[PDB]
Design an enzyme around this catalytic site. Structure first.
Site, mmCIF file in Angstrom:
data_model
loop_
_atom_site.group_PDB
_atom_site.id
_atom_site.type_symbol
_atom_site.label_atom_id
_atom_site.label_comp_id
_atom_site.label_asym_id
_atom_site.label_seq_id
_atom_site.Cartn_x
_atom_site.Cartn_y
_atom_site.Cartn_z
ATOM 1 N N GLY D 48 5.854 -5.660 -3.201
ATOM 2 C CA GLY D 48 4.725 -4.739 -3.306
ATOM 3 C C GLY D 48 3.427 -5.256 -2.666
ATOM 4 N N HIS D 49 3.440 -6.504 -2.206
ATOM 5 C CA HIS D 49 2.241 -7.144 -1.726
ATOM 6 C C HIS D 49 2.542 -8.026 -0.507
ATOM 7 C CE1 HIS D 49 -1.502 -9.621 -2.026
ATOM 8 N NE2 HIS D 49 -1.980 -8.591 -2.701
ATOM 9 N N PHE D 50 2.619 -7.419 0.675
ATOM 10 C CA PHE D 50 2.600 -5.980 0.853
ATOM 11 C C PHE D 50 3.922 -5.551 1.482
ATOM 12 C CE2 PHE D 50 -1.808 -7.420 0.918
ATOM 13 C CZ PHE D 50 -2.401 -6.560 0.019
#
EC number: 4.2.1.59
Lengths: 136, 138, 139, 138, 125, 135
Positions: D48-50
């Site tokens: 999710g990052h990223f």
């Protein structure tokens, strides 16, 4: 009678991990009825907390599996649950079971679909319910 | 009576990723419960439901309604199982940001089956309503 | 605006997208956003096993994502967001499942690539955390 | 003093996905510590990052350093709390492949609050530095 | 013959790397037939591979090795050899885990799906 | 080259992408890659709850992806065989897994490789790998 695999399923349903719950379609009578499969293994993310000391397939997820088969029946040849009715749960479902997903079409009345749904494990009935759905 | 996630943890066997009650707002023991479930995009089901557009799965609403029901059962008093769901209707899409107010009222007990009327509200509107029937084992 | 506009503006995704909704937006000046805290969040299993406590660093992370919305709004996968500094950060209240984290962020100054913000996270009108945040944007 | 993830597991309560110290390489008890944190792309935050570009979140470097501070505090001697972060500077983007050396010197103890000087290094160069204020409760 | 709950008391493995759902037949200290269900709802499938689900070969070896530990510790990982993967295993397969004791701990192992051989290997512990 | 080139060449993703960095590459002949081992990886919670231990088979998988990188570098991935795999060390959180993979022979759609995983210069696992690339 159409028969198709997890690859065909992916093109038909928007659902993904951790909540895509139909592995295989065994028999499909287009727009009429469907027999799908859902393998149950201890290595699925919910088992760890349902329950820690003892694995139990959450019954709401058996309903979810069935509604996903219902959706394949619709989409074959986003999904939203409108209603669940007369749901009955008759067996604890565990790791090792194969979950036969039987769903038949009943009615369509204004963008709501009614289905009759039964999940079996080894010929015996594990759960049954009437589902009502809509797409958007 | 009212209590927090810490008392909740001591009362339910459910854990991540399927412990779906964050707080008990009111408990009239053995009668009724108003509980809280925060919906946030930072829950593991949202990644798959659906990838383009988060939507709380209707069934996890039912599931949360059942855990509120187990709290009703277990508080002021071992696994929880569903036996039936009837008249379950979904009226609103629930999303990250919503607070799911979980109203559950005990209705009858008969040969191991507890039955409840369940209403989930978001902003004072009904998101789901269902009648729940559950048992307890081992 | 809602989690859908939010998704069109931030590149952050699970398990680190920690803003759910935008309550108020004075464009380029300030934002009040919302992060719902629930026990169903992946970090709570580890932090801690006995007793769920929202990690203070993730409150800060939530405040910085809010700042970024303040930045990117009224103005997709490849423009990324980076902390350059954090000053004067104080944690005053433990934040728990149940809490709605109100994310207040005000723009203070920009120079040579850095945005400074004053940030305050509240739970129920009480200050959970506050920090000065300095952040940059790349590619 | 040199000890491993196993001693670490006995000293800290943090667990997955937020146990961010893999090994201690140097401990001057109650004065300083050099710990280690392996950064790999198989860590749950990187998805999710990223998406499409892995970047270690700076706040998790802060978290890693604080856990090294907690160890300095608990060794040769129950939860841990952040009270404050000051003068935090992030000088390199940290990525899969980097070993993070966690350098923490104890600086002061006033009425319940520990304060530390913290520096995270990658390949000899400083990735992050910060002053950390912490406290131990229940 | 025994179930997941029994398995949980005999192996320390846990999620996401417990890969035996059920023991179909065990002839103690000599052979074991074990089951491992494969469904698209397992954590590895989302990155193996994104376009197309495919059970990691190394995971079939893992499941067979767990099948082999069960053989070992009921009624009471050092090497792989000659491992060949003949079939792609997919969601929906019921992976039948056959493991025979061949000397001592060495084992011959064959993972079958729908009666075809999916993979085979010698295992040492 | 780095995790970013790696992403452009392997289709693998979380939770089974297991190379962080390529340290040396003799194109079409050999590769030295890196795999950081940290407690903050999804498998460690189950393997094993008491005591983290990297699973032997995931070391093999790491070596195999180094071979994929070697195959794809200057020019879907399927395991066909594994031979003479011995595991000579318990790999832990904190260890850097050096992934040494030499290409040996390509006959009839099968790439063969000798592979060695080292920790702190000492051998952790060694194996011969046979792979092939589809679609």
């Amino acid at each position: 009678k159409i028969n198709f695999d997890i690859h065909k399923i992916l093109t038909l349903l928007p659902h993904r991990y951790p909540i895509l719950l139909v592995d295989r379609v065994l028999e499909l009578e287009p727009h009429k009825s469907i027999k799908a499969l859902k393998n149950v293994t201890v290595n699925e993310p919910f088992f760890t907390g349902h329950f820690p000391k003892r694995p139990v397939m959450p019954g709401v997820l058996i309903i979810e599996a069935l509604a996903q088969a219902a959706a394949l029946l619709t989409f074959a040849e986003l999904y939203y649950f409108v209603g669940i009715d007369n749901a009955r749960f008759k067996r604890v479902v565990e790791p090792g079971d194969q979950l036969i997903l039987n769903v038949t079409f009943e009615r369509y009345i204004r963008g709501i679909w009614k289905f009759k749904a039964v999940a079996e494990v080894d010929g015996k009935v594990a759960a049954e319910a009437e589902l009502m759905c809509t797409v958007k």
